[PDB]
Amino acid sequence: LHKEPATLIKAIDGDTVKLMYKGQPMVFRLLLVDTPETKHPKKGVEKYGPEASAFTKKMVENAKKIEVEFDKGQRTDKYGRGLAYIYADGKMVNEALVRQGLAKVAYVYKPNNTHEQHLRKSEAQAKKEKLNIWS
């Protein structure tokens, strides 16, 4: 896995950001994580949804450098969104959300699972500290 540069366009939700990647706007879904959402019917704005969404937004809006890292498997989902690990100045956003109890590790589809154990470890630590989702 290699990182590639990208430029923020807009944060959309806790688990989705719009980036300029190789000169084209593209929606990216963060791999391996489920945040509570602000944008989904039935529910609408779930609990900790605004919080997860504000966390991702600040983190990418205050970064100097954004990098995307695709995994080994498919790089887009059925909605056209890029599937990737997103980094803000060296720090993985997917992991930060998980470590803060603002996301759960999703159901995993091999082979897009390279960072799975690392996230699962952060998730185990956030439950132990009973952070947010886990409180």
Curated annotation (Swiss-Prot):
The gene is nuc. It is found in: Secreted. Residues 115-131 have a biased composition (Basic and acidic residues). Ca(2+) binds at residues 15, 34-35. The active site is at 29, 37, 81. Residues 115-135 are annotated as: Disordered. This is Nuclease A.
